[PDB]
Amino acid sequence: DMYIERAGDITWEKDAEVTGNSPRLDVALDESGDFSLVE
Amino acid sequence: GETTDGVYRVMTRRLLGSTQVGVGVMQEGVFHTMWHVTKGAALRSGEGRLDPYWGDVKQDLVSYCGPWKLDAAWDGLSEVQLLAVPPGERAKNIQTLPGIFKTKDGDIGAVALDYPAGTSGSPILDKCGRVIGLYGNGVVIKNGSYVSAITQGKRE
Ligand SMILES: Cn1cc(NC(=O)c2cccc3ncccc23)cn1
Secondary structure, eight states, X not given: OOEEEEEEOOOOXXXXXXXXXXXXXXXXXXXXXXXXXXX | OOOOSEEEEEEESSSSSOEEEEEEEEETTEEEEEHHHHTTOOEEETTEEEOEEEEETTTTEEEXXXXXXXXXXXXXXXXXXXXXXOTTSOOBOOEEOOEXXXXXXXXXXXXXXXXXXXXXXXXXXXXXXXXXEESSOEEEXXXXXXXXXXXXXXXO
């Protein structure tokens, strides 16, 4: 029986690390909920 | 058990030691995770049990104790944060501006922040600390890095 443990308040941080890009990917989705790229 | 709002770790002992299989969001007495993290199974909190209420393998979403409660949406412009919860590590905000999943049915926000699959279910937030979706369903790109949809459910 899988169990959960608490981890924090749901908060935006002022002065948090700003990384990560913004790509435009062409995507599909299968009936089993798996995304795939469409070139 | 614990019904306080916030982010939780989803753990199992059905392997070596205690293993974090994913993450979730407790809000308005409903636990929200990704389907691939629990496969629809019941959860323990304290000696209390959480039973699945709603799920969809195609959305890859599942709610416990009540219907899906999170209705906020990426505005299409503003930066967001992956309030990530990696396995063995403290909760950590990682800020970014979302890119785009383009599909026949419509366009979806995405994030290119790679992390252990055990972070699956970590909540993505807007500037007001509203959950606009969950991290951990997307695609491996040419690079070899992972890009995740901002997966959000529908509130009835
Ligand atoms: C069955 N299934 C599994 C997933 N998601 C993943 O495995 C996954 C989630 C988050 C980050 C990742 N990074 C690298 C590689 C995978 C991941 C979605 N569906």
